[PDB]
Amino acid sequence: SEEEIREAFRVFDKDGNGYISAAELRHVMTNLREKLTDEEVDEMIREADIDGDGQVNYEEFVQMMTAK
Question: Where Phosphotyrosine occurs, residue numbers?
Answer without folding.
Answer: 19, 58
